Paper text:
The recognition of antigenic peptide-MHC (pMHC) molecules by T-cell receptors (TCR) initiates the T-cell mediated immune response. TCRs are expressed as heterodimers of α/β or γ/δ chains in complex with three CD3 dimers (CD3εδ, CD3εγ, CD3ζζ) that are responsible for initiating downstream signaling. Here, we report cryoEM structures of two distinct full-length α/β TCR-CD3 complexes bound to their pMHC ligand, the cancer-testis antigen HLA-A2/MAGEA4 (230–239). We also determined cryoEM structures of pMHCs containing MAGEA4 (230–239) peptide and the closely related MAGEA8 (232–241) peptide in the absence of TCR, which provided a structural explanation for the MAGEA4 preference displayed by the TCRs.
Numbering used by the authors:
A (entry chain C): 1 to 12
B (entry chain A): 1 to 224, 228 to 276
C (entry chain B): 1 to 99
The structure:
Amino acid sequence: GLYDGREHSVGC
Amino acid sequence: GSHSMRYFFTSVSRPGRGEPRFIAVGYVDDTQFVRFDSDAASQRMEPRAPWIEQEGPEYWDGETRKVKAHSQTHRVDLGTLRGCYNQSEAGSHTVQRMYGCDVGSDWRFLRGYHQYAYDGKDYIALKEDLRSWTAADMAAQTTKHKWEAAHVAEQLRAYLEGTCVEWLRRYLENGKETLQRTDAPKTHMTHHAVSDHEATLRCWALSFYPAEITLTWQRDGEDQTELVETRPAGDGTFQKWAAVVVPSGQEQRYTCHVQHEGLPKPLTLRWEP
Amino acid sequence: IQRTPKIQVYSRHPAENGKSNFLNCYVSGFHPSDIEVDLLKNGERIEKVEHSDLSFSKDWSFYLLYYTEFTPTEKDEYACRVNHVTLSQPKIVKWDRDM
């Protein structure tokens, strides 16, 4: 089972 | 014995030839059980194990949705990272990710990890206490502030302490005849002839599972020798060998010691010609 | 940044002339991911090779596995040609039965 919920990106 | 379940994601960029490639595999401790590929024609989270095909259709629908949600974030990570490094628009740069969770012999949470890389260099990671990050430059530090002002770790701890272990226990219960087995290695020792007054003993260990073994030579009691990586046999087993160069005439004084989880008592190997 | 692969060519079961078997070519430890691997018989290519998926180790270095089905014979020679970015020329590894 994968990870569900509010995937965040990288800021730079 | 302990058990684990990990996930590996990859996103290689391609400029001018379309969209970045995206491969995502999933492992129980040493057995791949699912995969995905952005170039195959299925566009679905395809099974790769016998004990996993017996799940319903909603499971596969959810898995496909989530693995497609991950790639849409990798594709933007690539662009942002290329932009904030003053790099060209013609090379191919790689982003990798990995996470999972461990359980003990009593099948309760033991450890959890979540990492992130860029061009093969560590970028950011979740510490052993699952509450603080580990930066590596000014870039990682700014990302750490952004992720720490959105409690990202709090959201990513519930999963690894709850649902990861729940899924791992469900999988371990279903595929019991495959995941909970230990195969004892089959060992033999050979002989070469490099010159007139030398030799090269070798200690083989074939077709064992899991992939954690140790081979050591001992010149009558003292440790020392070229080893090779544990290589996959292709059908869910593994192989390994270790060799020690030795002057000729002294061959009944060397021993090879084999230690595997599937072996109750340590095995000793001596030259019996 | 860039690492160079490590090649091993072996057979699944212990080789024996006349019995069906498999030929593996396990490359590991390279970076980046774009690699070209071929299994050769008598110097010519083989058309029906399959490979596993792109995984990586704890230090972010990839590894693959190419395999095909063959029948060993005392007259034929098998090999594995690999070509990476960090290699200035291809690398031909032969299959000696004891490794």
